[PDB]
């Protein structure tokens, strides 16, 4: 979530993802903690047995066979955390995650109901005013002349400066807004 | 692998600004600036029973007796069960009893 995906997944990353998915489906099958610990140690032993491969084409074939075995022996209902996608509490509070720009449309009486918070809100808005031009200049300067670029973004490079495109990250609504 | 230094510095600065923003999301103690209990059986439930039940019961009873019974077939009820040995209140005739019940094995 906080890091952008690359152009492709490396073999090492795919092996780690397969290992994590296999252990999650193993806990979904095993349920009991001692049973899962036993069979997860067995799975870790299998991965360590196939760890030291140098040809790397045999390693790719082994990865393909292993994930084929995983798709054959995957749980029909694997355990999903409630906040995870496909879970029960996933996107439950998007109806309550109101974006911050409605306070610009709030009435002066409602603004007067919260004076100090609103004063801090225009302090933050003034900081955004002052930092936007500098961070646009930084983004234009740090862009490579080549067509290669990723979705990663530079940090602030000197004192009194903010990271470019920081507003939508810093001022995002809370996952427990109420 | 781990974090590259650019994204590590970016996340540290972004998280510090997130700490500042979430601290600024707090409320001062004066915010928001807004412009006979007895016992539960004697006042909490009694007032509710005499206010939100008694007046509606009065209105429904008025409507039922003076705007439904005045009309022919609004309130139509089935005949009540009449058993042998019973006395009819409206007519005054007693229902004759049954036969001699030959089977009394149980």
């Amino acid at each position: 979530a906080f890091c952008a995906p690359p152009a492709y997944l490396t073999h090492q990353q795919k092996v780690l993802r397969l290992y994590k998915r296999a252990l999650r489906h193993l806990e979904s099958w095993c349920i009991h903690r001692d049973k899962y610990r036993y069979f997860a140690c067995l799975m870790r032993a299998r991965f360590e047995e196939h760890k030291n491969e140098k040809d790397m084409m045999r390693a790719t074939q082994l990865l393909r066979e292993a994930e084929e075995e995983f798709w054959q022996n995957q749980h029909p209902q694997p355990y999903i955390f409630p906040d995870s996608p496909g879970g029960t509490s996933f996107e439950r509070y998007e109806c309550y995650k109101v974006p911050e720009w409605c306070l610009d449309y709030w009435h002066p009486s409602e603004k007067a109901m919260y004076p100090d918070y609103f004063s801090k809100r225009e302090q933050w808005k003034k900081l955004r005013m002052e930092s936007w031009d500098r961070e646009v200049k930084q983004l234009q300067e740090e862009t490579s002349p080549d067509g290669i670029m990723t979705e990663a973004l530079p940090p602030a490079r000197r004192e009194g400066d903010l990271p470019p495109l920081w507003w939508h990250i810093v001022t995002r609504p809370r996952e427990r807004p109420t | 692998s781990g974090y590259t230094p650019d994204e590590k510095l970016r996340l540290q600065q972004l998280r510090e600004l997130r700490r500042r923003w979430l601290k600024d999301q707090e409320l001062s103690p004066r915010e928001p600036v807004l412009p006979k209990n007895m016992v539960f059986k004697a006042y909490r439930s009694s007032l509710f029973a005499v206010s939100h039940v008694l007046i509606p019961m009065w209105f429904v009873h008025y409507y039922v007796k003076y705007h439904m019974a005045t009309k022919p077939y609004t309130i139509v009820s089935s005949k009540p069960r009449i058993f042998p040995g019973d006395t009819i209140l409206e007519t005054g005739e007693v229902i004759p009893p049954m036969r001699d019940f030959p089977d009394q094995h149980h």
Binding site: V98, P99, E100, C102, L103, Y105, W106, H107, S109, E110, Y114, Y117, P173, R174, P177, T178 | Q25, E26, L27, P29
Partner: peptide, 13 residues
Amino acid sequence: GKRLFVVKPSLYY
């Protein structure tokens, strides 16, 4: 205590 602001739309109108 430790209560936080709740962001809401303009219900005034």
